[PDB]
Amino acid sequence: PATRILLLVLAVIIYGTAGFHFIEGESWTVSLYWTFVTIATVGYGDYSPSTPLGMYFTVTLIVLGIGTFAVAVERLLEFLRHVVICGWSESTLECLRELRGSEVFVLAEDENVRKKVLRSGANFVHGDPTRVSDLEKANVRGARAVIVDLESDSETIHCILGIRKIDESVRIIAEAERYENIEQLRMAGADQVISPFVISGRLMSRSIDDGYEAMFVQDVLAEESTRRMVEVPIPEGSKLEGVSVLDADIHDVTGVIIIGVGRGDELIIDPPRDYSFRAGDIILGIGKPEEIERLKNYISA
């Protein structure tokens, strides 16, 4: 019915522009040109509608002059490597703050959010991350990875399954509100789970004494003090491949502290001395950018 009114304002043009070539200077060709020109509150002057009786029909083009302008308006506006964030929460916000330098889409239920999700360098997709149809509104298929944090682990567990139901291989990262659901959250298909509260809690209990243990975690993740925790990959042909951690003395050599090495989906912290670097191996280390750069070279080719 909304597109059925654009037929009445289209008929007024064949009824309003019709009396132009009939009640004035004949021109069945430039008849609509008079109507559109007149209705568009233009009034250039290609026909002042002089006829008196044609002034009565010219008055009709004034009445139905808004029944096509205020009409074709809502009808003209009723046609014409990215990351998706399901759910909009502080976690999400703080996250969107880092991903600022890239294409991010926040899919959320509450519209009121929009305005702010925009104040932060992200695009807003109004929908419910639980409905696959809306997940698609954010194009999860092509999402480099999806971050999920809804109000209740239940809704999150849902959203995940939904995502799976589309691209069953996108990297999904979810926040767990309660420790007791971390596993279900994985079963559902989350690849990585983060439990802000378990971290927070432990850090608390661990800062009753001295708060360095908690000072570490928070400071390291903050873009301050130069020192930066970085994960460096070992190229296929590495002058290390086969070498022992103990033998490479990466610290003495690079200055980059290695807090652990990773074999996709798994990571070891104080890697034992007799550890042997491989190809896909990833180095989790903290260090001055220089040190880092130096570390990359000490491995290159």
Task: State the binding site for Ca(2+).
Answer: 149, 175, 177
Contact (CB, 8 A) for 191 and 173: yes
Q: Please, which residue, 196 or 235, has the CB nearer to its own copies?
A: 196
Handedness of CA 30, 32, 35, 38 (dihedral sign): negative
- The nearest distance, CB 8 to its own copies, in angstroms, is 9
* Binding partner at 239 among its own copies, Ca ion, none, C-beta below 5 to 8 Å by kind: none
Q: Please, which residue, 95 or 240, has the CB nearer to its own copies?
A: 95
Q: Please, which residue, 149 or 281, has the CB nearer to Ca ion?
A: 149
Binding residues: 149, 175, 177
Contact (CB, 8 A) for 103 and 81: yes
Could you give the C-alpha distances from 281 to 12, 209, 253, in angstroms and in order? 72, 36, 19
Where in 163-288 does DSSP place strands (E)? 171-175, 192-194, 228-233, 257-262, 267-268, 282-287
* Binding partner at 255 among Ca ion, its own copies, none, C-beta below 5 to 8 Å by kind: its own copies
Among 17, 120, 130, 238, binds its own copies (CB under 8 A): 130
Binding of Ca ion by 123 (CB under 5 A): no
Among 58, 109, 117, 295, binds its own copies (CB under 8 A): 58
Contact (CB, 8 A) for 45 and 18: no
- The nearest distance, CB 237 to its own copies, in angstroms, is 20
Structure tokens at 25: 């200077």
Q: Please, which residue, 17 or 181, has the CB nearer to Ca ion?
A: 181
Strand pairing partners for 288?
A: none
Residues preceding chain discontinuities in the chain with C to N over 2.5 Å: 80
- The nearest distance, CB 98 to Ca ion, in angstroms, is 16
Segment near Ca ion (CB under 5 A); pick from 61-69, 84-92, 251-259, 274-282: 84-92
Segment near its own copies (CB under 8 A); pick from 15-23, 207-215, 235-243, 293-301: 207-215
State which of positions 138-177 bind Ca ion (CB under 5 A): 149
Strands 257-262 and 82-86: unpaired
Strand pairing partners for 84?
A: 105, 146
Which residues form the interface with Ca ion (CB under 5 A)?
89, 91, 149
